[PDB]
Design a protein around this motif. Sequence first.
Motif: not given
Lengths: 673, 673
Positions: A408-410, A412, A534-537
Amino acid sequence: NQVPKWIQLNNEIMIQKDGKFQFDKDKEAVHSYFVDYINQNTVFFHNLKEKLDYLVENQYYEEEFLSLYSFEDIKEVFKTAYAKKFRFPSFMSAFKFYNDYALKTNDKKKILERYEDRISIVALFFANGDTEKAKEYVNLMINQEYQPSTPTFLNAGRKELVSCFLLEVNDSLNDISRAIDISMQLSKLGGGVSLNLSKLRAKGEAIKDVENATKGVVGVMKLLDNAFRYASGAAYLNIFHRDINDFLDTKKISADEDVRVKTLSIGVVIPDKFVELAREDKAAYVFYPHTIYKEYGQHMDEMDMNEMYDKFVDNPRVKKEKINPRKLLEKLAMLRSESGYPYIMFQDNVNKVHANNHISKVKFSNLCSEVLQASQVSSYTDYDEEDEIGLDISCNLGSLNILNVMEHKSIEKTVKLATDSLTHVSETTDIRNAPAVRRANKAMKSIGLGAMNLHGYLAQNGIAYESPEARDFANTFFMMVNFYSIQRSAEIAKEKGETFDQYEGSTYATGEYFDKYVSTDFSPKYEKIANLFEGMHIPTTEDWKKLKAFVAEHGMYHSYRLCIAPTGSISYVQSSTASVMPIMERIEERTYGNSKTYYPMPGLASNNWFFYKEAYDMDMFKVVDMIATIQQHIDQGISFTLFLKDTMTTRDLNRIDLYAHHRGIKTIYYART
Amino acid sequence: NQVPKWIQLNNEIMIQKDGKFQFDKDKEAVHSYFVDYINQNTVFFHNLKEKLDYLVENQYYEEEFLSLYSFEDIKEVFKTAYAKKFRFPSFMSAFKFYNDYALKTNDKKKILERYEDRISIVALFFANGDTEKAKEYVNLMINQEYQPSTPTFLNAGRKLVSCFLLEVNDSLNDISRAIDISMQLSKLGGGVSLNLSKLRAKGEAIKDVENATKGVVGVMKLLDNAFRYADSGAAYLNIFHRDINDFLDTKKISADEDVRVKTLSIGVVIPDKFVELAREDKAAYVFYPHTIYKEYGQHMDEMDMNEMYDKFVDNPRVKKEKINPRKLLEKLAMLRSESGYPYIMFQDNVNKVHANNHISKVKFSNLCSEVLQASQVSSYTDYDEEDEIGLDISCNLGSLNILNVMEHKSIEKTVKLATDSLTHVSETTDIRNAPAVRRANKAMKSIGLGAMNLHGYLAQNGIAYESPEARDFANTFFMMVNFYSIQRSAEIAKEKGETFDQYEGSTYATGEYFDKYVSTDFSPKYEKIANLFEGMHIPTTEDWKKLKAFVAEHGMYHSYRLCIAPTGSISYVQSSTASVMPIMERIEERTYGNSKTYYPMPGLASNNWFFYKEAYDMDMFKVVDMIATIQQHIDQGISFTLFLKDTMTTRDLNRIDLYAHHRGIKTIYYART
Ligand SMILES: Nc1ncnc2c1ncn2[C@H]1C[C@H](O)[C@@H](COP(=O)(O)OP(=O)(O)OP(=O)(O)O)O1
Ligand SMILES: Nc1ncnc2c1ncn2[C@H]1C[C@H](O)[C@@H](COP(=O)(O)OP(=O)(O)OP(=O)(O)O)O1
Ligand SMILES: Nc1ncnc2c1ncn2[C@H]1C[C@H](O)[C@@H](COP(=O)(O)OP(=O)(O)OP(=O)(O)O)O1
Ligand SMILES: Nc1ncnc2c1ncn2[C@H]1C[C@H](O)[C@@H](COP(=O)(O)OP(=O)(O)OP(=O)(O)O)O1
C-alpha cells in the motif's frame, strides 16, 4: 471419539498428490471451522445497543472511555469494520485467536467478541476523542498493516499493560527486601521482570564487623528462584567478579539439589578488555567489588575497564584473583553446547553507538534481550528514613507487517499512527507499588516499535535470504523507517514543546547521531530492489539536513523509539513469519490433543520451495552481516537467535561469536538445535 | 446436579408471601431463561443473506416459494417482524416452543429459527405473491390474533393435515385396501379413523357355508396390530348390530389377552329410535346387516331407523335379536364410569340441522370428534378390474384468540385473512396413495375455523362462567363470526365463480339455513355485555337479507367452514386457556425431569380468584346450555368434554346424557375424574 471434520481436512495436506501437498484443502478446512465450531457458540444479539448495554452491566468493559462518544459514531466505526468482509487465510489464523486471545465468558465456554469487535475496541481506545482517527486506526489494523503488542492487544478495556520491567538492586538488606517485594508485586501483573546483581559483595567476605561472613550471590539467586515460584524472569551479571564460575555452574545438566534454578535465566556482560585478554592469551583478574566501593567510593562497572583495569591491578588495596580467559570462553562454549544458556551482551558495541550515554551507560538488558537504556540505582533506607529514587526501564512494544506496507506504500502514515498509539499507551500506564518505575515512565517516555515478516515477503518475491540485494533492500527500508520515525517524533515534540529531560545532554541535540546521514546516501544499488520501492518518494541527504535543522529548532519527544522482539505468539494472528530470524521448518506440526495440526508456512507453493530455505542449512556469517546492516539504524538490541546443529563445532561457534563482536552485534539469544 | 437458575426461580411461586403467590418472580425466571440457556445455543450469523444461503444448501427450506420474491421484500418482512420487540408473558410460553416446535439442527443440539423466523416463514408461505399481504399476515400473527393448526405450524417449508376419515366397503379386497391406506397415512402422522358399518357380523355365511365369519373382533385385532407398526386412531360403529356387546367388551379393566386394544378408541352411533325404546322400556332388535343387503340391496344405516325399524321387525327375512336397551345404557354408564370410553354421536341432532344432507347423511366422526361431513363409500375390485371412487373427509384446522380480537376489533379482517390462509393450504395439499381422499379434497374444499380462549377472557373481565350474560355474549359473538364467515365465502365465490359441486342440492342455495336469521335478532340483552362490543358495528337482520340476496347471486365457495378442536398443544404458545371447556386446575404442575415446573393460569391475580372456578365444582347443565348456545351457529361438532368426580353418580351421568340429547348437543368426549 471421532476426529471432527476440519481437523481431518487439515490432516489431508501431507497426502502426496503428484508429489505435492493438498494446499487447496486447507481453506476448505477453514471453511469447515467457521461452520461446525465457531458459529454455534456465539452469544446471539439483536443489534448493537442492547449488546453494549449487556456488556456494561456484567463488569466486562471499562465504561469511562466507552461513554465519551455518541452511539452513532461507534455504530459508524463498527460499520466500517464489518464493511471489509474479512477472511482468514489459514487454519491456525483462526485457531490461535478464538482459543486464547479473544474474549470468553465467565464460565469460559462461550464467545462474545468477534474478530471485528476486538480490533474496533482497540481502535476506540487509541482514539481518545476523534472518530475519524479511530476510522484511520481501523483502516490501519484491518488490512493487517500494524499489530500492537501482546498485553495491549489482550487487556484493552477489561479488568497490567506493559510486559517488560528492568530494575537494579542496591547493596543492603533493605534493598534485597525491596527487590523481592517489587518482584512479587509485578509478578501478578504478568509482565517480564529481570534483575541485575552488579553492585553486590561476593561470597566469603566481611559483613561490616566480621570477615568471611557472606553467603554470596547463590543465596540471593535461591531466594529469587523460590520467589518467582509463588506467582518467571532472569538476571544478568558483569563478568569481573569472583563468583562468576558459581554464577555459571547453576545451569548444569548434572544439577545440584541446592544449586538448581528452573526459573531464572542468567547472562554475562563482557567489555572489550576481557575480549582482548582472551585473544592475546594472558592472565585475568576478577575482583572483590566491595573493596572497590570502600576504596574509590563508586561502584565497579560504573567506570571503564579499559581505563582502570591495570590500575586496579596496581592497587594493593583491591584484592584480586587470577584466572584464565581462554579456558573460560571454552567453558562458555561448552555450556552453550549443553543448552545455549546464558545470555551475552557486548556493552562496548552498545555504548559507542548509544545516544544517551551522558546519563549513564547501559549495563544489562531485559528478559527479551532487546531494550538497552539508561538505569540509575535507587537506595532504599530504613522505615522512618526517606529513600532516594533512581531510574528504571519499562518498555511497551509493538511491531508491523512489512508485506502490506509494501502493498500500500502508506509507510509514513503507518508510522504516524503507531507512534501516537504507543504514546497514548505510555500516557495511560500507571503502577502504584514501584515508585522508581513510576518516575521513569513519567520521565523518559520510551516507546518501542519494530517489524516482523522479513523472511517470507522477500522469499515470496523470489530473492534468496543470503543475497546482498536483500541486505541493500533492508538498509534502504530501515533507513526510511528511522527517517520518518524521527520526523514524527520531531513533529510531536513541536506539538507539545516539552522534550524529555536532559535533552541537551543527548547527542540528538548536537546532531552527532545525524552525522552519519549528512553523507553516505543509502540509494538502492540494484535495479530489482529499486523496482520494489518504485512508485513512492525516497528522501535524500539534504532532506536529512532539513531534518537536522528541524530537530535543532525544537528537539525530539522520545528518547528511544525502536525494538525488535521475537513476537511469535502474535505472529500467527497476522498470518506471517517471525521477525528477521528466518524460519526453522517449512511445516510446523503440533498436537493440540488427539490431533496432528499441520501448519504450512504462508506462501508455500511449488515454485518458491527453494527460497523457503532451512535454518540448519544457512551461512551464519551472512546472517550476522544482515543483522549488522539492520543494526545501522536501530537504537536498541535486535532479537538475534543462533541456529545450530549437533554436527557443528564449538570452535566454529566461538568463531561466530568473535565475528559478531567484530561486526558489532549487540546481543544474542539462546541457541537452537 | 444443581437445578439451574430459572427453574429455581419458577419454583418460588408457591412460597406464601402474605398468603399469596410470587407472580412477580415469574417474569424474572423468564428473564433468566433468555440468558442462561437460549442465547447460548443460537447459531450466529452476520446478516440475512448468507443466513438464507446457508439454510438453502443443507436441505432445510423448500427453495421454490422462497425464490418467488425479491431479497429486499423479504428483508422488509423480517424488519416488520423484528420491529415489534415481542416478549413472552410466562415461563411455559418459551419452553413449549423452544423445545419441540421450533426448528433444530441435524444433531438436534442447536437452534436456528428464532420466534420471528417461524412466523415470518409461515407468512411468506401464506403470501404466494403479495408482499403487503404477507405484512398483513405478520401483523395478524405477531399480535397473537390468529393461530394456524399444529402440522401447518410445524411443517411449513421443510421436509400437512392431521385428520382423515374413511369408509370400509365389504370385501376381502376392501379390507386389504383399508389396511394399506392406514399404513400409508400412518407415516404421515395425521389422525386416521375408520368405520365398520357395512360389515357382516360374527357367525355368518361367507358366500357358500353358514357360520363362517369371525366377525368384527378380528378386524379390530388386525387394525390394532396395524397401527403398532408406525408412528393411533379409532373406529366407530352404529348400534343396531349383534356384536355391539363384543364391540364394548374390548375396553375392559379385566382385559382378555386376545380382546385387548391399547391403540384404537371406539365409539357408538345412536339415533332417536333407540333413545325412544330405552325411554319407554320395551324390547330392542339388533340385526344381521348382510341379510338386509341381500333383501333390499342397500346397506343398513343408509335408511331411517324411525321409518324402517318396525318394517324390519315385520320382515321374516331379516334375522333379528331381542335385547334390553335400558340395561345397555346402564352398561354404557358403567363403562364410562370405568374410564369414559367410548365416544357418542347423536346423528339425528346432526342431520336435522345439517345443510348438505342431499348428498348423504353423516354416519361417524374423526378421532378429534368434531368433523361431521358427507361420506360416500368406494368399492375396491380385483387387480385388473377397475375400481369405483367414493368420497372421503380430510379437514385441516385452525383457531384464534378471542382476547386480542376484543382488544383490536379487527374481527372481520381477521376472518378475511384466515379464510384465504386455509384456502391456500387446501390448495397446496396432495396425497398420492389414497385416491378417494384426493378426489374429495379437490372436490369439497372443506376448511375448518375455530377459537380458543373463552374461559380466561370472560373470567378476567369479571363475569362468572355460569352467567346467562356470557351465554348472550357468546351468542352475539358467534353470530357475528358466522356472519362475516359466510360473507367472506360469498366474496371468494364471486372472485372465482366456481362453487363446490351440487351446490343447488344444498340448503345454502335455497336459503333454508338463512331462515333462522331473517328474524329473531341476536342483539345483546345486557348492558355490560353491550359495553364489550361497544365501539364497532353489529349487523341487523336486513343485513342478513342482503347477505341472502348476495348468496343467491353467486353462491358460497366452501361447503364447511367451522370446527372446534381441543387445541391444547398449541394453546401454550398463544399463552392462554383451552377452548370453550373451562380449566381444570388453577395451577398446572409438571415434572420435566428432576424438576417441578409450576404453571399458573394467565391473569391469575388476587381479585379474580373467584372467577377462576374449578371444573369439578360447576353446574353441568349450564355448561351444556352454553355449548347449545354455541351450537346455534356451528355446522360441525364441538369438542365437549365431561368433567366428573368419583362422588358423582351414573344416574346423574345418564341424566346429563339425556339432557344433552334433549338440548341437541352433537357429540361428547372422554370424561375426566
Ligand atoms: N476464513 C474465514 N474468516 C472469517 N470468516 C469465515 C472464514 N471462513 C468462513 N467464514 C465465516 C463467514 C460466514 O459467516 C461463514 C461462512 O460464509 P462464507 O462463505 O465464508 O462468506 P460469503 O457469504 O462471503 O461467501 P459465499 O457468498 O460464497 O457464501 O463463516
Ligand atoms: N545476616 C546477613 N547474612 C548475610 N548477608 C547479610 C546479612 N546482613 C547483611 N548482609 C549482606 C547483604 C547486604 O547487602 C550486605 C550489607 O548489609 P547491610 O548491613 O544492609 O549494609 P550497610 O548499608 O548497613 O553498610 P555496609 O555498606 O558497610 O555493608 O551484606
Ligand atoms: N420474555 C421474553 N421474550 C423474548 N425475549 C426475551 C424475553 N425475556 C428476555 N428476552 C430476550 C430479549 C433480549 O435478547 C434478551 C434480554 O433482553 P431484554 O432485557 O429482555 O430486552 P430490552 O433490551 O428491551 O430491555 P432492557 O432495555 O431493560 O434491557 O433476551
Ligand atoms: N377366508 C375368510 N375368512 C373370513 N372372512 C372372510 C374370508 N373370506 C372372505 N371373508 C369375509 C370378509 C369379506 O368382507 C366378506 C365377504 O368376502 P368376499 O368374498 O370378498 O365378498 P364378495 O364381494 O365376493 O361377495 P359377497 O357379498 O356375497 O360376500 O366375508
